[PDB]
Amino acid sequence: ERPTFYRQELNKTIWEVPERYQNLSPVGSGAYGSVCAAFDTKTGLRVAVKKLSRPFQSIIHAKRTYRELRLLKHMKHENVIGLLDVFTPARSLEEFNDVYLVTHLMGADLNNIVKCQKLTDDHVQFLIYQILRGLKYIHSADIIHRDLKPSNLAVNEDCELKILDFGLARHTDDEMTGYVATRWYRAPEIMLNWMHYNQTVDIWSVGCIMAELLTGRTLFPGTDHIDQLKLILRLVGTPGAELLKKISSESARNYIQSLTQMPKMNFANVFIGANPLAVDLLEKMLVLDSDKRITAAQALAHAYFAQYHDPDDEPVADPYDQSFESRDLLIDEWKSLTYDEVISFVPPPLD
């Protein structure tokens, strides 16, 4: 019942994978990590196979490995990247070193489809509907994406969409400095560490994506953190007395107060000629105070999506046990937990 594995070198690594996966070919030019498109002969799908780099290099990497595998195993929703397969060539814990993860190969990201382009109003509707449908599922598991942006949205030829890279630490270290897209979708409370934030950060990111799909333009392309914040307050107004109380960082509060106050702008004059229902939705997403943003479950019931909305086809998730997050473990302990999670994996049904 353990498959037969075969070896090859791909992008200077030895990849050892079950024979069911044929014709492995690097994709994304390193942008997604060590990932190969392959043909899965068992399901007949084109799949993306990721070989984790340095999975057990430090306590921090070990845990990051475990976390990503936990997150992927839990997700079973059409608009969320999940696991078709997870394997290692190792036959015991003692020889366990590498982890390979397998999911559907969508083929492109939103970003590398829609660069510089206003999309038709039904393409916007359909794409945002799907982001919000996947997001309602993710949030119902108490998972926060934290890094939603076009590059993290994997889209296929039929404009079907799956959300990538949710709930990871990873986005931390790579650069958020200067004129960089890694920062343009971030909610201001997380960009400037205003407070203990939560899942509402992601609705901000949805707003920013939706605007950009409408206009063809990045909504807040700041040259840095401070220039971006000025872009943001110009549109959505400076914080009022109520939000200021909630900015638990005295440092941030004190800098915000130094800015000339500005009223919210009129979204109908900003998004000239766009569906009024779209405007109204963006107004509900791009609210400076996170507590007041629309939720994904609520946005799905908004009239903009009336063509796609179906409350019996917008599932929620099983509860996700993230107690491990507060556990203080050694490398070998995270590695063994990870091993158990590999070994116990159950394939989805092939129809």
Ligand SMILES: CC(C)c1nnc2ccc(-c3ocnc3-c3ccc(F)cc3)cn12
């Ligand atoms: C072209 C590109 C955007 C793309 N298309 N489909 C996909 C699918 C996945 C990934 C991916 O990006 C970063 N990590 C992964 C990943 C995650 C889990 C897994 F099992 C295998 C790979 C990229 N994809």
